[PDB]
């Protein structure tokens, strides 16, 4: 589903702004 | 899963805080 | 620093595209 | 780290793959 | 609806490029 | 509303000009 | 100026995420 | 303004909230 | 369809990262 | 068409390589 | 160079919005 | 080119239109 890929691209930018120096891990699978 | 929670329902800013290292 | 933040914003976008289903860990300086 | 290398020099796709899980 | 949030993120970048120095106001509600 | 106009139908560049300060 | 424009592009994206349903007024220098 | 402060110093989430409606 | 416009905005950033110095052409029609 | 191929089905990185000059 | 890459990332986004259905050819230096 | 002009000086919408197909 292409809609999943588009939403993930907005999740990575949200985690980057929120986590900041802490960092984030993105793991859909 | 973050894909199964924050992409099927809109997540507030604090909901994104949970996955921070 | 400000410009370092801007590079990371595009950096996480690039990492998300390149990795894909594998995912990644983002750790800043 | 990732910032210390890719934000000062352009990183190729192979170099980005080293940061993937 | 998540599709509303995604479209809004593209509206803010469109207003920023169009308005420029004038500025913009985003008010969905 | 901008959400009810430019997000249910595609808006041209001038359609975005209306909401500029 | 060019780099100031780039910061504003990410700035409006950050403001959109942080505020949300409230909305915001963006006024540049 | 917003540019004069946040584009020269990193603005925290509380500082961004001051610009919200 | 607005979903077409959103996906195209992600295609242009994917071509830019992939093509790099080569460059890309975007031609939906 | 790139719109009719990479936007109705998810395209891998190499699928984007085809349209590079 | 790094900052030149960042400007191009926003440049292709701006060109995509402005042109629209016409499309464009992006050629870097 | 496009980079040599718009990445050193802010390009207006008309100038961007010159690069459209
Ligand atoms: C990896 O494949 C993620 C596993 C869960 C995917 C769920 C996809 C459901 C289809 C999309 C529904 C929501 C559309 C915005
Ligand atoms: C976080 O504190 C950043 C640490 C890296 C050092 C930043 C400055 C390195 C020298 C570059 C100076 C260029 C800007 C005047
Ligand atoms: C605030 O909630 C905005 C009020 C109007 C919302 C309309 C949402 C309609 C559902 C989405 C339809 C279009 C999907 C792209
Ligand atoms: C719009 O005209 C911008 C006004 C703010 C002043 C910009 C320059 C401030 C001093 C920084 C110089 C650094 C770049 C050489
Ligand atoms: C120009 O109009 C492009 C020609 C092909 C458009 C196909 C649009 C199909 C409707 C969207 C289906 C997929 C939604 C993600
Ligand atoms: C690719 O090689 C870029 C070619 C353009 C020249 C870049 C440098 C021009 C002078 C600006 C120096 C400012 C940074 C110290
Ligand atoms: Cl930048
Ligand atoms: Cl989207
Ligand atoms: Zn999007
Ligand atoms: Zn940038």
Curated annotation (Swiss-Prot), chains B, D, F, H, J, L:
Disulfide bonds join 6-11. It comes from the Eukaryota. This is Insulin A chain. It comes from Homo sapiens.
